[PDB]
Amino acid sequence: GVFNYETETTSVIPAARLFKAFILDGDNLFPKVAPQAISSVENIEGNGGPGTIKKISFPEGFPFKYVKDRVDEVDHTNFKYNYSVIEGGPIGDTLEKISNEIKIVATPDGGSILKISNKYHTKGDHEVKAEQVKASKEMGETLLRAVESYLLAHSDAYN
Numbered sequence: 001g002v003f004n005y006e007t008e009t010t011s012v013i014p015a016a017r018l019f020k021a022f023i024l025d026g027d028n029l030f031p032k033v034a035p036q037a038i039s040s041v042e043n044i045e046g047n048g049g050p051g052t053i054k055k056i057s058f059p060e061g062f063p064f065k066y067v068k069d070r071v072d073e074v075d076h077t078n079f080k081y082n083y084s085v086i087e088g089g090p091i092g093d094t095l096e097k098i099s100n101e102i103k104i105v106a107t108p109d110g111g112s113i114l115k116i117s118n119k120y121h122t123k124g125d126h127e128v129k130a131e132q133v134k135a136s137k138e139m140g141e142t143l144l145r146a147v148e149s150y151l152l153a154h155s156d157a158y159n
């Protein structure tokens, strides 16, 4: 079955620029700006569109070594990015896939809001609790804040 978790978080970076950096150049940015969260991003197959597969590796001592994701949809107009975690780490005999959706919306102060849906697809039993899903949220926030800091300091990047 499916467990759905939704959250929102704010950014001080305008939506289009954040989308260009965090989404469209994340493979480069994350290992650069948050190497103690993501050690590397490997493009396995594809050009970035639907079906593209990447391997996201984590630093030594993290609970999981890597995951592979597959890009599901990229909406450059509405700043939407959907992808699925389809192998590695927690994926196996209890968890079949994690389907995620990110949407970035502009706020009038010149910042943005990220609207996130995480859907865990399990094989029958058992359960995915909010407390454990906190690790997803924490990692996501760490990556966002690292990218934000870079974009604040490098004003010529991703305009």
Ligand SMILES: C[C@H](CCC(=O)O)[C@H]1CC[C@H]2[C@@H]3CC[C@@H]4C[C@H](O)CC[C@]4(C)[C@H]3C[C@H](O)[C@]12C
Pocket (backbone or CB within 6 Å): 022, 023, 024, 025, 026, 027, 028, 030, 054, 056, 067, 069, 083, 085, 098, 100, 118, 136, 137, 139, 140, 143
């Ligand atoms: C933001 C990129 C997409 C852009 C890109 O591939 O460069 C996506 C692609 C894969 C994503 C990761 C997949 C595994 C994790 C899923 C969790 O539920 C949230 C944290 C992690 C660590 C995700 C963080 C982030 O949401 C990533 C890194």
Ligand SMILES: C[C@H](CCC(=O)O)[C@H]1CC[C@H]2[C@@H]3CC[C@@H]4C[C@H](O)CC[C@]4(C)[C@H]3C[C@H](O)[C@]12C
Pocket (backbone or CB within 6 Å): 058, 062, 063, 064, 065, 067, 089, 090, 094, 095, 098, 127, 128, 129, 132, 133, 135, 136, 139
């Ligand atoms: C808590 C869920 C669900 C686990 C289950 O019940 O099967 C699992 C599934 C995907 C897991 C994430 C995969 C990517 C990351 C791997 C890191 O090495 C530790 C942080 C992250 C962000 C993990 C945190 C957490 O361990 C998650 C979010």
